[PDB]
C-alpha cells in the first residue's frame, strides 16, 4: 500500500 520511500498513503 506504501512504496519504499513512502509514496503515498
Amino acid at each position, epitope marked *: *500500500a*506504501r512504496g519504499l520511500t513512502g*509514496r503515498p498513503g
Partner: antibody
Amino acid sequence: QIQLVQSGPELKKPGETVKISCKASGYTFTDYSIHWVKQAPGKGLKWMGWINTETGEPTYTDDFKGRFAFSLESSASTAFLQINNLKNEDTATYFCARATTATELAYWGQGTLVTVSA
Amino acid sequence: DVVMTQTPLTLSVTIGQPASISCKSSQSLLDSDGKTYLNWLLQRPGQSPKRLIYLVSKLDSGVPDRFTGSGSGTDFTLKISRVEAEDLGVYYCWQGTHFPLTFGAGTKLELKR
C-alpha cells in the same frame, strides 16, 4: 487547511535525550507518510527517513540508524522524533513533512531547532 | 546514493530579468511507471522549505506561472522568466526515484549590482 506544527526550540547537553512533536491538521492523519529531514545551521538538507502512519513502521537512512526513533500518537494526529545520547553534531533544525501521491516532501512543518551544548 | 549536481551554486540575478538553474543526476531518474520523480523546492530566508515543482514540470498549487521546470533522463532545468524579490532564497532539486531520497547542494539567488 493542511498544516504541520512542530514543538518549540530545545537546548540540551551531550548524552541527554530530546523528543520533538509534529501535530498534523486538515486531513485524515493515517492517509499519508510523515518524513523527517535535518538541516545543520547554514547547510543543505538531508532526509532521515519516514514513518508509516497506518502501521506505524519506521524506515531510517544509514546515518540515522541507532540513536533515532520515529513514533506516533495517532489519536492526537501526532508524530514524534526522539534522539538519544545527544552529540554536538546533532545541532540543527529538524523538519517533519507529509507525502502526496507524486512527492514525498510536499507539506512542511516550520522546523524545530535543537542545540546541543555542555 | 544518487548525486544531484546543481549549477551554479550562486546565481546573480536582476529584478525583471530571467534566471536559469541546471540540475544533473548521477543516474537516470525515469522510474518503473514511466514517471520521473524530480522535484524543486524554495527556501526563503528564515523560513522552512517550500514545494515548487514535482514530476519535472508540474507547478504546485498557487505557485507563480512564471516558474518553468523541464528535462528528462539525467539533465533537468528550472527557469524563471522574470525574477522578483519574492523569488530570492535557496533553490534545491531533489529526487524520489531511488531510495534514499537525495538533494542537490542548493543554489542561492543574490542581487547583481
